[PDB]
């Protein structure tokens, strides 16, 4: 299973095991995820998959994602965001999941 | 899909190309349906291929290790930097056939 690491977020935090809520789980499965429980790295991996495959990044500024009017925009609750602002991105993903025990 | 740059003239990114069979197969493995693409479109599918297979280095995410992968056979290097767009265009241009 794919996973991505960032240098901006503590390791132990990236390794948290989590259970996506239904909308998020549906998004992940739409890009090939098979399971119900993931580390946060694996969640970041499949969301990268999704952004890429729907070409949500802006053609001119490819670090800006326009998620407005898209399921991702629903989940995150913003029209757009920068892929450089990782803590921000973790904050947005968190309300869409439950931590496992 | 489609993607573009700014180290390469935008006109040139729109150039219409016909990948050779191995490169075409690589593109088919990530969902490309056509025989001919814009260079932008080819780049887009190559970026997807690299993302999906995690060819990029874990730490240095702008470095791609293609050694021992079909991508390496095509490109003829074991690694390269995604920031060197001309070098990447050149590698792709060597893997086309004529429409
Ligand atoms: O040329 C330059 O100057 C810059 C080029 C460059 O450095 N490119 C490197 C791209 C590396 C991509 C590695 C894989 O990344 C991911 O899996 C990933 N997952 C994400 C999920 C979200 Cl919600 C947002 C972004 C990404 C993302 C990604 C992306 C990305 C950009 C556009 C796109 F369509 C897909 C992914 N770029 C870097 N990353 C790494 C990353 C990891 C964790 C976090 Cl919290 C944020 C970012
Ligand atoms: O997290 C951070 O702090 C910084 C991260 C960041 O800035 N991310 C930028 C967003 C990534 C953009 C994704 C869309 O890009 C592509 O479609 C693309 N296609 C390629 C084909 C090859 Cl052979 C190599 C790289 C890419 C690539 C890509 C990538 C990339 C990096 C790692 C990866 F696994 C996949 C794509 N990063 C930027 N790009 C843009 C780009 C466009 C044209 C050319 Cl000639 C070179 C690069």
Swiss-Prot record, chain A:
Keyword Hydrolase: no
Tissues in which the protein is found: Ubiquitous. Isoform Mdm2-A, isoform Mdm2-B, isoform Mdm2-C, isoform Mdm2-D, isoform Mdm2-E, isoform Mdm2-F and isoform Mdm2-G are observed in a range of cancers but absent in normal tissues.
Molecular function terms from GO: 5S rRNA binding; disordered domain specific binding; enzyme binding; identical protein binding; ligase activity; NEDD8 ligase activity; p53 binding; peroxisome proliferator activated receptor binding
Compartments in which it is found: Nucleus, Nucleoplasm; Cytoplasm; Nucleus, Nucleolus; Nucleus
GO CC term (a single one): postsynaptic density
Annotated region described as Sufficient to promote the mitochondrial pathway of apoptosis, given as residue ranges: 1-91
UniProt-annotated stretches for the region Necessary for interaction with USP2: 1-100
Domain (SWIB/MDM2): residue spans on this chain: 16-99
Family: Belongs to the MDM2/MDM4 family.
Misc. comment: MDM2 RING finger mutations that failed to ubiquitinate p53 in vitro did not target p53 for degradation when expressed in cells.
Quaternary structure annotation from Swiss-Prot or TrEMBL: Interacts with p53/TP53, TP73/p73, RBL5 and RP11. Binds specifically to RNA. Can interact with RB1, E1A-associated protein EP300 and the E2F1 transcription factor. Forms a ternary complex with p53/TP53 and WWOX. Interacts with CDKN2AIP, RFWD3, USP7, PYHIN1, and RBBP6. Interacts with ARRB1 and ARRB2. Interacts with PSMA3. Found in a trimeric complex with MDM2, MDM4 and USP2. Interacts with USP2 (via N-terminus and C-terminus). Interacts with MDM4. Part of a complex with MDM2, DAXX, RASSF1 and USP7. Part of a complex with DAXX, MDM2 and USP7. Interacts directly with DAXX and USP7.
Role, per record: E3 ubiquitin-protein ligase that mediates ubiquitination of p53/TP53, leading to its degradation by the proteasome. Inhibits p53/TP53- and p73/TP73-mediated cell cycle arrest and apoptosis by binding its transcriptional activation domain. Also acts as a ubiquitin ligase E3 toward itself and ARRB1. Permits the nuclear export of p53/TP53. Promotes proteasome-dependent ubiquitin-independent degradation of retinoblastoma RB1 protein. Inhibits DAXX-mediated apoptosis by inducing its ubiquitination and degradation. Component of the TRIM28/KAP1-MDM2-p53/TP53 complex involved in stabilizing p53/TP53.
Notes concerning its domains: Region I is sufficient for binding p53 and inhibiting its G1 arrest and apoptosis functions. It also binds p73 and E2F1. Region II contains most of a central acidic region required for interaction with ribosomal protein L5 and a putative C4-type zinc finger. The RING finger domain which coordinates two molecules of zinc interacts specifically with RNA whether or not zinc is present and mediates the heterooligomerization with MDM4. It is also essential for its ubiquitin ligase E3 activity toward p53 and itself.
Annotated protein name in UniProt: E3 ubiquitin-protein ligase Mdm2
Lineage, highest ranks first: Eukaryota, Metazoa, Chordata, Craniata, Vertebrata
Gene name of this polypeptide: MDM2
Span of the entire protein shown here: 11 to 111 of 491
């Amino acid at each position: 299973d794919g996973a991505v690491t960032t240098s901006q977020i503590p390791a132990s935090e990236q390794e948290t095991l989590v259970r996506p809520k239904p909308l998020l789980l549906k998004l992940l499965k739409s890009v090939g995820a098979q399971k119900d429980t993931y580390t946060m790295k694996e969640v970041l991996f499949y969301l990268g998959q999704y952004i890429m495959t729907k070409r949500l990044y802006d053609e001119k500024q490819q670090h800006i994602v326009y998620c407005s009017n898209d399921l991702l925009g629903d989940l995150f609750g913003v029209p757009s965001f920068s892929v450089k602002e990782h803590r921000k991105i973790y904050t947005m993903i968190y309300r869409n999941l439950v931590v496992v025990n």
